Amino acid sequence: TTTLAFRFQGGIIVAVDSRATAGNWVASQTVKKVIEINPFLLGTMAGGAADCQFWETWLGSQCRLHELREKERISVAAASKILSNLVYQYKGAGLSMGTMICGYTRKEGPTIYYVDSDGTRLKGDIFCVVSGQTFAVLDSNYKWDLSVEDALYLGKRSILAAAHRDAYSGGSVNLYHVTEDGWIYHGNHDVGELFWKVKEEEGSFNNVIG
Amino acid sequence: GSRRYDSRTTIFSPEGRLYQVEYALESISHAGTAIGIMASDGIVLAAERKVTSTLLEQDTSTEKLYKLNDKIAVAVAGLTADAEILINTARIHAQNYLKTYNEDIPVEILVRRLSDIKQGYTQHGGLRPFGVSFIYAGYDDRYGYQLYTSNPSGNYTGWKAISVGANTSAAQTLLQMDYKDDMKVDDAIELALKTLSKTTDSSALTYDRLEFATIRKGANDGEVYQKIFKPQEIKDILVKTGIT
Amino acid sequence: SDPSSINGGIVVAMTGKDCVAIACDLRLGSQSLGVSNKFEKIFHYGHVFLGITGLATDVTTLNEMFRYKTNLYKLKEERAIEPETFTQLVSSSLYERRFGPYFVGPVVAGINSKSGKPFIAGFDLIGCIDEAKDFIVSGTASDQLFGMCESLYEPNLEPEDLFETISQALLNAADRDALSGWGAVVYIIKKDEVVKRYLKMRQD
Amino acid sequence: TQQPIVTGTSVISMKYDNGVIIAADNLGSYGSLLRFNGVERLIPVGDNTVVGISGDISDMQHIERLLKDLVTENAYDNPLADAEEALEPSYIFEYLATVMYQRRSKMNPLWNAIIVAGVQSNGDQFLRYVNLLGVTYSSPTLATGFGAHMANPLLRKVVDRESDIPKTTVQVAEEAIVNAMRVLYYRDARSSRNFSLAIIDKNTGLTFKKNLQVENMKWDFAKDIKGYGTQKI
Amino acid sequence: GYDRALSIFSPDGHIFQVEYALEAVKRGTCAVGVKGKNCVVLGCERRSTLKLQDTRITPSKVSKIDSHVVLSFSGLNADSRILIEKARVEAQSHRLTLEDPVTVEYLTRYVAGVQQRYTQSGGVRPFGVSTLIAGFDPRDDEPKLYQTEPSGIYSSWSAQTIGRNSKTVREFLEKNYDRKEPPATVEECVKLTVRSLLEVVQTGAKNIEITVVKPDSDIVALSSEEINQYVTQIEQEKQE
Amino acid sequence: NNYDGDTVTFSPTGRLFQVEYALEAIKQGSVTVGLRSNTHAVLVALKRNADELSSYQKKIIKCDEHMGLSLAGLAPDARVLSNYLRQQCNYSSLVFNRKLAVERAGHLLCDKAQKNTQSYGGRPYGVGLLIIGYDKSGAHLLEFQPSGNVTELYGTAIGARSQGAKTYLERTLDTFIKIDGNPDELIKAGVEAISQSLRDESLTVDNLSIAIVGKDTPFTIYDGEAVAKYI
Amino acid sequence: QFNPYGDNGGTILGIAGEDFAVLAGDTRNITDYSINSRYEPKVFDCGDNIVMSANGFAADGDALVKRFKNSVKWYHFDHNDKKLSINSAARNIQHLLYGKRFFPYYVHTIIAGLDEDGKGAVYSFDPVGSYEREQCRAGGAAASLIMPFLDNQVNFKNQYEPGTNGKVKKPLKYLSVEEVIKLVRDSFTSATERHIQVGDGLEILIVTKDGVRKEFYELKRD
Amino acid sequence: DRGVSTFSPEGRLFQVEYSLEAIKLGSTAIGIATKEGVVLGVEKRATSPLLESDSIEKIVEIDRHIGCAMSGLTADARSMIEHARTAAVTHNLYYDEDINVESLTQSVCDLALRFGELMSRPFGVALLIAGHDADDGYQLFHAEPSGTFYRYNAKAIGSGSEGAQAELLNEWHSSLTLKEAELLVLKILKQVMEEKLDENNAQLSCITKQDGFKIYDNEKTAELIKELKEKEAAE
Amino acid sequence: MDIILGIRVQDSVILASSKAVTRGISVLKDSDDKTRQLSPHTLMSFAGEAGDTVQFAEYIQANIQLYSIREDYELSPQAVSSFVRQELAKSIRSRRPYQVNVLIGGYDKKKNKPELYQIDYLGTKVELPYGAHGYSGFYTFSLLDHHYRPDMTTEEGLDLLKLCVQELEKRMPMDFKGVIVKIVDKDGIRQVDDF
Structure with missing residues (x-):
């Protein structure tokens, strides 16, 4: 599993792979590791697929109740802390979850929170989870003053880098652009077709023959 | 069923008064007078025991003045048994605070907790309120010497001088007349006894009808001493102030 | 891992002629690391002295608990608790946590205000009372203290002689224990005066 | 969670043209000790159902009481208790299957394998299995424990599929069961010679046979077997 | 547990225990709220029947719920403490979970919600308390003033009064408070609040308490002398 | 008088006035008819509107594929008792793979209603129910009173002016019991029965509610233009 | 110790067509190396044009199907006989499964039907209620034998246009119900040859706008 | 006193009947x-x-x-x-x-x-309770403290209800436009209200399939009030 | 592992806390602030188990902020430290104990003296001139034992702290990505930008 979220001038880029494995067996190449909590909030799937889906669908329900009661869009800080407080109640029971809660509000600007099954809640500019490892991939071509088109490509290229090397990452790349007025889907890209095109056009992956 | 026999102890009258609180205050008005006077250099608690007997063991008797901790004491007006239930609760809260913070409980925090318990009995549970009014004499290092009162309603207020029980109207007028801000403990002792001596329903005020206490920084240097007066000590201060 | 030897430290109590002595080291550690040299393990509630060895969090908790309980006792009884009565309260309090005990070795020392009789007692962590005439030992160097006390101790020592005996018993026992030392305090207790002495000792 | 103490071995059963047959031996084993011999492990419920039970005997005696209580309860405020509102095999099974799965789901099972044999109101053969895991299945032949390994193969040679059931008479079905009980006596170190056999027929009703013995056994060939290889005497 | 339904409907569709609670409020000392352009002022009556009072330690009539919100009340003092405690707990609970201090409207809605609950719960009587809740929402410069009452209804007010002779001081505010131009400065707002209490109070001595709340958690209680200067200036302008 | 303050008090003549007052709520309720043959059982209910803008209050509730009732009185109480029947029917199916007998459903409704008549703090149910069903002993009609009294009948009616429909059914008894394998004719007899309980108002398309259960007929409710056939 | 779980073997296959869906399963029930039954149905009509299978531990499978069927019955009662859409059924089954998150239903669940636009739908669930909408899903013992074949013969993966040398992918064509059933039958015939837990019989439930119909085919009994 | 769940001799719950008076x-x-x-x-x-x-x-x-x-x-x-x-x-x-x-x-x-x-x-x-669903389209319900709810084509509740309901009886038809309904609510509110109806003492709202539930701006309602006044003066 | 250091100088208390957040082998953050302002003159730093650290710190903050509002008074550092200790002493015998270690640095306005309290996850509390939690204590303590003087100025304390961090950066296998330094004095709590 490779999930990437980073903050830039144009908002937030969210990039994920679509591969699910049971042992060596590839269960699916068409998993959706981005959970659309609501039209302005996105969640990433890592660890337990059920735990991530169930509690981030629940988070959307809790977010909707907040907006009815307070007649205001819920802040990313508040939405993230509902989820972090809930998993902390279950701590030691065997919930498995590593997620990036992504939203853009006028109050906060573009905001990413990393939320953990261990009860960790961290705000950061960039978060990446690769197959049981999470961190602030290549990090060489990332600058705040980056175009929306360029930032989308960087996220797409970053997932391609992991998918090639990592056995448990692959299938396709799913792209999301998060703006103040909501998120925009930037489509499903097969890693097979992407790899050959990226290789040819970038010149990269010289070691691989094609 | 049972509803038939319920007095409904926690309802408003059409005037917006609490029946059982008002009737409890009526009960307290027939209790022996207790007076608290706060001076610059300490507090005085003076209280009248209700029509006593010659066979009552006074030196081992306590109905008015109780110790809550080393810094805080209360004068009681009302049902002694009801007061003891609340006093034991207050003693436990004081020790809970000391255990938690490693600091003696500030006077108001203790007073507020006891007042909040009384309040509860007037709003839920369908039980009769506590037929008790307290004068709290205490010292802490935030506000220094403090006098408070609480009544069955669970309302509490701060005072320079105050009375509870019988003839409070008369007692408060006399205190309001002779009290000054620069007053000292020895002066306050005299005022308290003179006030009881004039308001008492008894023929004369004697040692065997009084309970007396002083909270003084008259403790060697930067500390506070509580003094629950012995029968002989009350007899001496009555002669000193020239009442007997 | 063993809760009674994480923080380390020792207490010893002795009886003399119309006097008792109670003494403790000043070390608090995290196993091999020394953290504090000012962790006194002897407390007093009126004229009754309590030493507590073992897990430092429980030493602090039980001190706060017995201050709490002796404060309420005094308010209700209108007199200071006596050593014999306090010993029963310590036992009662420890045994109520029978299946989740405080990891402590308490030691009571004091003189009965009415009889004038010197009193010492020790307890296991669940409140079993050792009421020895001679001496009580507790802590990570209890073996060493037993050794020192059993040879150094003789009955009916005068206060200023008892001071030397208990001091030499503590110091030499602590110097043969890794988790004890870093200074020591000795209380010499008489019916209506108590002297507290800090001992000079090696700081390793 | 427990462990079985006193245990009963194979229950075997099969459907025939007009009804069902079920059989089980009378032993109650205490580990390797064959402690109890007069244990009845076929418990009839009315005149249309027989419940064959293997595994823990203390749990069997509990289930026996549940079924006895079920018949009492069904008769309460029920004018048609001995007619249209009599207990069906299907009702008795579903109840036991509910209990078995609930008990496994509380991690405190009834340590048994149960076969419910009977004939329904409409004359349909009923044969279904349930065990300590709440696992259920139906087949033209059913057997528990060793029976599953040795009885099923023999019974399946008579009724291999649903279409064989109308072609199988009660005489052929009983013969196959009695032979399978002999094979289990030869080869199951926890079997007894003494067994009970129950026939539930849609015409002749419930026929319950007690104190049956395995007979026509082959042992004579044993005299000619000497040593374990090279020995000739 | 004691389950008795004390708050019930009468044939005329009234809940007498809720209406008798309002009578407790009517008996309470007068409390007034006036919001200016960039402030809210809470004025409170102190009945002068109680002298020899220690004003240092005596429970003050205006309570901070958080650093940015204040609550004043008319009615049973003891009842008010339970609502103040619950409100203070909820203010910290909101900061802990939402990572933002309560809005004035949210804190009002909570207190009002507690008051309502006590009008259709078994074995409890309604609160003999009405509240004025004033302050500024985090990072907002718009003044907020809300009122609650025993029934549990709440609403926003340009200016409002509660307690004894509140009818009189509301009469004053209704003719003296212009919505198009509210008290522009702290001075003007405090003056209008003191003026409104002087209609009812008696002596302008220790009988009037004034608390000024400004944006960004700027809350201060005026002293006797500061208020006495307003009392002096008002009557000197009146002598004409 | 002095004995009607709660359900736990007998009168000096051994009456339960709260139960009798609950019984009164049914009489105020809109008329509903129940009747059966040997093959089918039919409910017919006159639905009551608040005014001309309002809908007509639904009277018939499905309890299972083989059982359901019609209500007269407090609709929320019918909802509670029908929900309880749904659960008891459901329990019988899940645990015993067995459709709950209509007679046993009657016994359960009786016992649930009874508990509310002997305990302090509670109140009797303020609704009457006509339960129809088809089980292993054929077609059944039950009348439920919130006293706890449940009665198996060939036909009956409850609600305002129900006596008219009940007298008609008492005359027609020998005719409608013989309407076997003809659902339409049994409903006609039910519609003709409820017509004896009408005054001023007549059966319109959004006024009439009919339910039927039978041998090869699951419990199905007919409303709107589905009952225009029978008007 | 007592193990509350078991393996009853079996293999199930859900395929979504353009205007239809199939849910297929073998009819063999096993424990270890024994056959319990050669015909124990594993795929069920649940009503509202939804077919379900919970393959794995048959006890947990029967319990979940029973609970879901009951959920449909109560949805009708509570929501004026509203038809339960396949998407709503899927979300409901997630809550049934996640309810036992800390003592799971030891099953792989597949439901098949039509979406609200009348297009074929299959939903696949993990034991704890993670779910996805899919065009192809095999579950159970022989899933690893079937899915690679379906990737090749349904989605035309690794297939290209002859004479383009892998520059033009084989174009995706809409498969008829008849061609899907051929691929199902060949999948199970192949699985039966190579997996010891697969055989005896194949039962296929086909869902269309016309409703649910049933097809049965014999498999090798060894 | 008497039970809270007590039936009157007429077969009505006292407390429910009393709440209807409130x-x-x-x-x-x-x-x-x-x-x-x-x-x-x-x-x-x-x-x-x-x-x-x-x-x-x-x-x-x-x-x-x-x-x-x-x-x-x-x-x-x-x-x-x-x-x-x-x-x-x-x-x-x-x-x-x-x-x-x-x-x-x-x-x-x-x-x-x-x-x-x-x-x-x-x-x-x-x-x-007003709303839209796919099954039964646009719906208005009246939820009472009795637990009973009626569906209504139009309904008034509160002090002016029986007067307003009589007016809704005459005015409502199945072909009403949203704009016609808005003016009709404003008209009947203005009739039964003590004070003179304006955008500050009255509030409008609507539920459409497209836009969902919306509370009207005071500016929007003010324009509909001005539209009402003109069309009433038009005859 | 995390570094939390405290040194109490003449007129203030300085807290140095490692900025790194690492789960297993990957570094989640390099700017983490392991501190909570309990009151205007009381600061708490914390290190320990993921989730527990922030949950415990925020819970203490909420309770001290509640007490501040209710009494319109600031609890003394001694009082705050005793409250924190009791909460930790409760949690060890609880179903799932808080694995959190804290340093409490506060300025006592009544006594006009700075105070530093060290409390471990068991509720073991000591008042020290300087303290640390974890492996960092071993390296740092011996250095502070030599250089520490009770009459040190804030600038001298920062220099001694700066020396400690440099030493830890060399001898520590882990990269803790530097420290954040906060000073607690009579004027309140401020962050040292330069370190």
Whole structure:
């Protein structure tokens, strides 16, 4: 599993792979590791697929109740802390979850929170989870003053880098652009077709023959 | 069923008064007078025991003045048994605070907790309120010497001088007349006894009808001493102030 | 891992002629690391002295608990608790946590205000009372203290002689224990005066 | 969670043209000790159902009481208790299957394998299995424990599929069961010679046979077997 | 547990225990709220029947719920403490979970919600308390003033009064408070609040308490002398 | 008088006035008819509107594929008792793979209603129910009173002016019991029965509610233009 | 110790067509190396044009199907006989499964039907209620034998246009119900040859706008 | 005294009948259902001119497809609104869909009779629940403290109800446009209101399939009031 | 592992806390602030188990902020430290104990003296001139034992702290990505930008 979220001038880029494995067996190449909590909030799937889906669908329900009661869009800080407080109640029971809660509000600007099954809640500019490892991939071509088109490509290229090397990452790349007025889907890209095109056009992956 | 026999102890009258609180205050008005006077250099608690007997063991008797901790004491007006239930609760809260913070409980925090318990009995549970009014004499290092009162309603207020029980109207007028801000403990002792001596329903005020206490920084240097007066000590201060 | 030897430290109590002595080291550690040299393990509630060895969090908790309980006792009884009565309260309090005990070795020392009789007692962590005439030992160097006390101790020592005996018993026992030392305090207790002495000792 | 103490071995059963047959031996084993011999492990419920039970005997005696209580309860405020509102095999099974799965789901099972044999109101053969895991299945032949390994193969040679059931008479079905009980006596170190056999027929009703013995056994060939290889005497 | 339904409907569709609670409020000392352009002022009556009072330690009539919100009340003092405690707990609970201090409207809605609950719960009587809740929402410069009452209804007010002779001081505010131009400065707002209490109070001595709340958690209680200067200036302008 | 303050008090003549007052709520309720043959059982209910803008209050509730009732009185109480029947029917199916007998459903409704008549703090149910069903002993009609009294009948009616429909059914008894394998004719007899309980108002398309259960007929409710056939 | 779980073997296959869906399963029930039954149905009509299978531990499978069927019955009662859409059924089954998150239903669940636009739908669930909408899903013992074949013969993966040398992918064509059933039958015939837990019989439930119909085919009994 | 759940000799629950009297004293709320949407209008009835009228919230959103107007002891409505919002969201969580308006109304009405010696008394507030679902289109429901709910083509509740309902009886037809319904609510509110109707003492709202539930701006309502005045002066 | 250091100088208390957040082998953050302002003159730093650290710190903050509002008074550092200790002493015998270690640095306005309290996850409390939690204590303590003087100025304390961090950066296998330094004095709590 490779999930990437980073903050830039144009908002937030969210990039994920679509591969699910049971042992060596590839269960699916068409998993959706981005959970659309609501039209302005996105969640990433890592660890337990059920735990991530169930509690981030629940988070959307809790977010909707907040907006009815307070007649205001819920802040990313508040939405993230509902989820972090809930998993902390279950701590030691065997919930498995590593997620990036992504939203853009006028109050906060573009905001990413990393939320953990261990009860960790961290705000950061960039978060990446690769197959049981999470961190602030290549990090060489990332600058705040980056175009929306360029930032989308960087996220797409970053997932391609992991998918090639990592056995448990692959299938396709799913792209999301998060703006103040909501998120925009930037489509499903097969890693097979992407790899050959990226290789040819970038010149990269010289070691691989094609 | 049972509803038939319920007095409904926690309802408003059409005037917006609490029946059982008002009737409890009526009960307290027939209790022996207790007076608290706060001076610059300490507090005085003076209280009248209700029509006593010659066979009552006074030196081992306590109905008015109780110790809550080393810094805080209360004068009681009302049902002694009801007061003891609340006093034991207050003693436990004081020790809970000391255990938690490693600091003696500030006077108001203790007073507020006891007042909040009384309040509860007037709003839920369908039980009769506590037929008790307290004068709290205490010292802490935030506000220094403090006098408070609480009544069955669970309302509490701060005072320079105050009375509870019988003839409070008369007692408060006399205190309001002779009290000054620069007053000292020895002066306050005299005022308290003179006030009881004039308001008492008894023929004369004697040692065997009084309970007396002083909270003084008259403790060697930067500390506070509580003094629950012995029968002989009350007899001496009555002669000193020239009442007997 | 063993809760009674994480923080380390020792207490010893002795009886003399119309006097008792109670003494403790000043070390608090995290196993091999020394953290504090000012962790006194002897407390007093009126004229009754309590030493507590073992897990430092429980030493602090039980001190706060017995201050709490002796404060309420005094308010209700209108007199200071006596050593014999306090010993029963310590036992009662420890045994109520029978299946989740405080990891402590308490030691009571004091003189009965009415009889004038010197009193010492020790307890296991669940409140079993050792009421020895001679001496009580507790802590990570209890073996060493037993050794020192059993040879150094003789009955009916005068206060200023008892001071030397208990001091030499503590110091030499602590110097043969890794988790004890870093200074020591000795209380010499008489019916209506108590002297507290800090001992000079090696700081390793 | 427990462990079985006193245990009963194979229950075997099969459907025939007009009804069902079920059989089980009378032993109650205490580990390797064959402690109890007069244990009845076929418990009839009315005149249309027989419940064959293997595994823990203390749990069997509990289930026996549940079924006895079920018949009492069904008769309460029920004018048609001995007619249209009599207990069906299907009702008795579903109840036991509910209990078995609930008990496994509380991690405190009834340590048994149960076969419910009977004939329904409409004359349909009923044969279904349930065990300590709440696992259920139906087949033209059913057997528990060793029976599953040795009885099923023999019974399946008579009724291999649903279409064989109308072609199988009660005489052929009983013969196959009695032979399978002999094979289990030869080869199951926890079997007894003494067994009970129950026939539930849609015409002749419930026929319950007690104190049956395995007979026509082959042992004579044993005299000619000497040593374990090279020995000739 | 004691389950008795004390708050019930009468044939005329009234809940007498809720209406008798309002009578407790009517008996309470007068409390007034006036919001200016960039402030809210809470004025409170102190009945002068109680002298020899220690004003240092005596429970003050205006309570901070958080650093940015204040609550004043008319009615049973003891009842008010339970609502103040619950409100203070909820203010910290909101900061802990939402990572933002309560809005004035949210804190009002909570207190009002507690008051309502006590009008259709078994074995409890309604609160003999009405509240004025004033302050500024985090990072907002718009003044907020809300009122609650025993029934549990709440609403926003340009200016409002509660307690004894509140009818009189509301009469004053209704003719003296212009919505198009509210008290522009702290001075003007405090003056209008003191003026409104002087209609009812008696002596302008220790009988009037004034608390000024400004944006960004700027809350201060005026002293006797500061208020006495307003009392002096008002009557000197009146002598004409 | 002095004995009607709660359900736990007998009168000096051994009456339960709260139960009798609950019984009164049914009489105020809109008329509903129940009747059966040997093959089918039919409910017919006159639905009551608040005014001309309002809908007509639904009277018939499905309890299972083989059982359901019609209500007269407090609709929320019918909802509670029908929900309880749904659960008891459901329990019988899940645990015993067995459709709950209509007679046993009657016994359960009786016992649930009874508990509310002997305990302090509670109140009797303020609704009457006509339960129809088809089980292993054929077609059944039950009348439920919130006293706890449940009665198996060939036909009956409850609600305002129900006596008219009940007298008609008492005359027609020998005719409608013989309407076997003809659902339409049994409903006609039910519609003709409820017509004896009408005054001023007549059966319109959004006024009439009919339910039927039978041998090869699951419990199905007919409303709107589905009952225009029978008007 | 007592193990509350078991393996009853079996293999199930859900395929979504353009205007239809199939849910297929073998009819063999096993424990270890024994056959319990050669015909124990594993795929069920649940009503509202939804077919379900919970393959794995048959006890947990029967319990979940029973609970879901009951959920449909109560949805009708509570929501004026509203038809339960396949998407709503899927979300409901997630809550049934996640309810036992800390003592799971030891099953792989597949439901098949039509979406609200009348297009074929299959939903696949993990034991704890993670779910996805899919065009192809095999579950159970022989899933690893079937899915690679379906990737090749349904989605035309690794297939290209002859004479383009892998520059033009084989174009995706809409498969008829008849061609899907051929691929199902060949999948199970192949699985039966190579997996010891697969055989005896194949039962296929086909869902269309016309409703649910049933097809049965014999498999090798060894 | 007497039981809270006691029946009168007529077979009515005293406390329910008494709560209906409390609702009669409530400010007027009017609902009109059309094929283009459902309109919800309320009288605000501020007790003083210093009360900021925009803080009076008697029209409330339950979900995007369900609006709600209240009349009576409005404080009692808050827990009913809370339950309705929770029921709407909870159903969407369980079933990945919008909850039917009737099912939402039925859920609210299940609270009603949960009183005795559960809450100490019935609710002293009536609700007009307006919404849209795919199955039964645009719907208006009247939820009473009796636990009974009626569907209405048009309904008035509160002090001016019997007068307003008689007016709705004459005015409502099946072909009403949303614009016609808006003016009709404003017209009947203006008739039964003590004070003169303006954009500050009255509030409009509507639920359409496209835009969902919307509370009207004071500026928007002010234009509809001016449109009403002109069309009434037009004959 | 995390570094939390405290040194109490003449007129203030300085807290140095490692900025790194690492789960297993990957570094989640390099700017983490392991501190909570309990009151205007009381600061708490914390290190320990993921989730527990922030949950415990925020819970203490909420309780001290509640007490501040209710009494319109600031609890003394001694009082705050005793409250924190008791909460930790409760949690060890609880179902799932808080694995959090804290340093409490506060300025006592009544006594006009700075105070530093060290409390471990068991509720073991000591008042020290300087303290640390974890492996960092071993390296740092011996250095502070030599250089520490009770009459040190804030600038001298920062220099001694700066020396400690440099030493830890060399001898520590882990990269803790530097420290954040906060000073607690009579004027309140401020962050040292330069370090």
